[PDB]
């Protein structure tokens, strides 16, 4: 469950961690699942979504 | 490909996308690779993580 970051990452949000490259992190389970990057082609709008959330159709 | 909203969800961020069960999502295609909930064992910061940015150890 450990990985080693390769680059350096700068926060945008209130909810995203900063590391730097050599960090070691360990994924934390989570009800929500991962997070992917969608548009609603019902609304027309787009972010980020927790996959546990939805269903392949 | 195309996936369906089992449940509400409202946005907590400026970058999450709320939606309503029902809504037809597509995935949008992305550098930064699915996120995770990562904590860092090198600084104890806990937060979401970009998974391309990072590798098995």
Same mark, same amino acid.
């Given at each position: ?15 995203? %961690? ?6 070691? %992190?360990?994924?934390? #389970? #989570?009800?929500?699942?991962? @997070? @992917? ?12 979504? /927790?996959? #546990?959330?939805?269903? /392949?159709?």
């Amino acid at each position: 469950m450990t990985f080693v970051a390769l680059y350096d990452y700068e926060s945008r949000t209130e909810t995203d %961690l900063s590391f730097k490259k050599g960090e070691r %992190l360990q994924i934390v #389970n #989570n009800t929500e699942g991962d @997070w @992917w990057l969608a548009h609603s082609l019902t609304t027309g709008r787009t972010g980020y979504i /927790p996959s #546990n959330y939805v269903a /392949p159709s």
